[PDB]
Structure 1
Amino acid sequence: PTIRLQEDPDPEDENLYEKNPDSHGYDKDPIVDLWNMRVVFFFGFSIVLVLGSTFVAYLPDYRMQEWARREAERLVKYREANGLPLMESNCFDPNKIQLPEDED
């Protein structure tokens, strides 16, 4: 037969606009297509996007940024009023530290 195998021919790609001039590219069924479009737009842009951005924008300050700012304000106020240095190089009290007795 000069052939190698029985096979279907390669089909031509179907155009979604042929049977549906306003096809939205979701499904070949116009009703299912329109409803897929509607749900995608509603739950993607209207619900998740805008409401999620609003929820993120107004998240409570759990990172303690304003708290840290106010604590720094109090601490700077106290240290400037009492004449103490603004920040100490030691973060731990040397009294609670026991270095090795001998360095030789």
Structure 2
Amino acid sequence: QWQEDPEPEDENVYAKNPDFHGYDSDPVVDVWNMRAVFFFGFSIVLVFGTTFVAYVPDYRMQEWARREAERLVKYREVNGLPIMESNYFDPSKIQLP
């Protein structure tokens, strides 16, 4: 038989210390690691980032496009133009082959 160390048994970390939070087995480092990832990850990134995301203005130009669509539909119905022409580019501007 070759010289190998045996399989190390999975000891109960909750039997070692009761306030085991999943981090390194030093309990002060474990508790402050939990406080650091909760305050730096769940507190100031999810909530502040949700605030920054919800107060990004006119994302993908949607609010300005709705206001310019209201202004354009109001202008076309005031001056009597049809509400969308069939061709976008002008046939007088185009050069046919």
TM-score of the superposition, structure 2-length normalised? 0.88
Q: How does 1:89-100 map to 2 (within 5 A)?
A: 89-100=86-97
1:77 aligned residue: 74
Structure 1 unaligned blocks of 5 or more: none
2:6 is aligned to 9
| Percent of paired sites with the same residue | 82
Query: What is the one-letter code of the residue matched to 1:41?
Result: F
User: What does residue range 29-68 of structure 1 map to in structure 2 within 5 Å?
Assistant: 29-68=26-65
Instruction: Check conservation: 1:24, 1:37, Cα contact below 8 A.
Output: yes
Cα deviations by residue, 1:55-82 (Å, 9 ceiling, x for unpaired): 1111122532222222222221222122
Q: Which runs of no fewer than 5 residues in structure 2 stay unpaired? A: none
Q: TM-score, normalised by structure 1?
A: 0.83
Which one-letter code corresponds to 1:57 in the other structure?
A: A
1:22 to 19, 22, 40: 19
Kindly tell me the number of residue pairs found equivalent between the two proteins. 97
Contact kept, 8 Å, 1:24 with 1:34, in 2: the verdict is yes
Secondary structure at the aligned position of 2:63 is classed as helix
Residue 93 of structure 1 and its aligned partner are, at CA, apart by: 0.7
Q: CA deviation digits over 1:25-72, x for unaligned, max 9? A: 212111111111111111111111111111111112253222222222
